[PDB]
Structure 1
Amino acid sequence: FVNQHLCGSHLVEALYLVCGERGHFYTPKT
């Protein structure tokens, strides 16, 4: 990804691409 006006799924994808296979605590309702 590239720095932009993220939200939701794109934000979850960005967090995964930054943090790696580790995972992260922000997972929203969809």
Structure 2
Amino acid sequence: FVNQHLCXSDLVEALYLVCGERGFFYTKPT
């Protein structure tokens, strides 16, 4: 894998490929 740098646009883009339709939902407020 590459440096795990994830920021919103990439955060979701990550869980999107890492999870996908599996159902991913990162946090934000908590």
Q: TM-score, normalised by structure 2?
A: 0.46
Q: Which has the higher helix share?
A: 1
User: Which of 1 and 2 has greater Rg?
Assistant: 2
TM-score by length of 1: 0.46
